[PDB]
């Protein structure tokens, strides 16, 4: 109303960065500031904010390194800070994806640009290359390699439905997982292929040096190198069910479901975990500080800082 | 209780709130909202002619803000135990204080919502085509299968029949046999809802909201254009609300004819819910919500 009078903003939606991370966009905007000195300011009431003592290994060890935690339970007043996708904008298109297996491509205004047919419902989220490839796996257990025209460039057959976003390295490289994690090359050939323990229902997150990082139901946080070769794996004694992130000194965060967790280097080494007592499901998302977020089923959410 | 986790999922398929927070009914016959420019009352339409609506029905658009959002499953609890699903194809009975009672492990990932009927046995389907029975000790009672993945919650009817939707729509007896099935004109992604009289209503990608008699033959169809994502919702009036992607709501009679329309103009993905009075929200993409009063 009186737009021609009255400026108007529109909100800020979560990105699905190509190495597989997800920014909040607003960042911190609405959570915190940082201080001259370095700390932090929390945009929440005094006592909702509460810093935690992550541990090394299980004989109690206590962790003494650079990294914060903090376990924030806004108020219902509060919610709105911090949110506790089936569609990706590029260029002034919306592309979203339906369960009645087409992928919309869908302007401004809302009208329909065209639509492209998979055989099944599609539940994973599509992402957007450089060049305007958009890159979305289907129930029907293919990865669709689509034009910006509508036009199909190609598609991978995989042997399970594709329910989860897809990463794109540096190299050009495109990271997915159904019934194994595939690494295909832009032109639609298979570079390698790993089975990390288990179908894979989550992102691979790409580091700068190349290594793919996939959690796995297993109870695992494996490491690949850019052949495909296991680099190594993590265990933890729960399923994890949400994509790991990287931190800005290249660790390697992740939790699993029952809210525990961790912070492993590069090497393979735990840095810390941290026990919160509260089931997780969501995944977590970083902001343009390098802060990492874990929201909880219960309504509060975890923030790491580096 | 439950603390480390924290609406209920009806069997007839609607789902409820549980409106305190949200407003009151005035004396006259009014109501009172607790949000003045963020509530605004729609008038519906009646058909494409341009003919408007002003029955019993009142439609009101909700814009809180940020700081009022406040105001407004993979799991369900029975019996003081948590039945939780996961995609690595289990079904988990948790304890209370978060121990694992057992597991039922179905060929691949979950996604729908697991049901639990009165006598206590526990209704899942799987992405590996089958609707799962499984009796409180974890134990299969049986399985049902289909020629698609099941990623919906299943609704159960007053006789026991248990149906849901994947392939195509199908009715199932409490012995795991199939009464009969439907397809209704595309593959099911959403629970059926059922009303009193036994009739199954579904929505459909298709664009159109099917009404199904208990014998399984098509009672009538209501046709939109527009694909449909959501779960239709009955309310007290015996009449079926849903709306298309593109936000465009819906209310038929149950004899099929349109009782009203109304163009949101902002897209709904989300299932719509009903409150202790009757009340259904349909709530929307951009954030909105749209209250409906019988």
Sequence with gaps: ????????????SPILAKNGTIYLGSSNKNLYAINTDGSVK???????????????????????????????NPDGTEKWRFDTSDFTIFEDILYVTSMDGHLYAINTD???????????????????????????????????????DGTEKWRF???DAIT???????????????????????????????????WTVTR???SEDGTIYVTSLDGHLYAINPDGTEKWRFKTGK???????????????????????????????????????????????????????????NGKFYALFN
Excluded: M, Q
């Design 157 to 159: 057959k995989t042997n």
């Design 42 to 72: 929390w945009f929440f009431k005094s006592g909702e904010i509460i810093e935690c003592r992550p541990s090394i290994g299980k004989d109690g060890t206590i962790y003494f390194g650079s990294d914060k935690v903090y376990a924030i």
């Design 204 to 206: 691979p997150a790409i």
């Design 110 to 148: 809302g009208t329909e640009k065209w639509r492209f047919k998979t055989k099944k419902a599609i539940y994973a989220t599509p992402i957007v290359s450089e060049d305007g490839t958009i890159y979305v796996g289907s129930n029907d257990n293919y990865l669709y390699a689509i034009n910006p």
């Design 239 to 297: 399923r994890i069910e949400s994509s790991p992130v990287i931190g800005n000194t290249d660790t390697i965060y992740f939790g699993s479901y029952d809210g525990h967790l961790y912070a492993i280097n590069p090497d393979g080494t735990e840095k810390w975990n941290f026990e919160t007592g509260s089931w997780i499901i969501a995944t977590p998302v970083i902001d343009e500080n390098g802060t990492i977020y874990f929201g909880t089923r």
């Design 164 to 198: 989860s976003a897809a990463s794109i390295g540096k190299d050009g490289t495109i990271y997915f997982g159904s019934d194994k994690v595939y690494a295909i090359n832009p032109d639609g050939t298979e570079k390698w292929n790993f089975y990390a323990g288990y």
């Design 1 to 12: 109303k009186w737009e021609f009078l009255i400026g108007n903003s529109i909100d800020s």
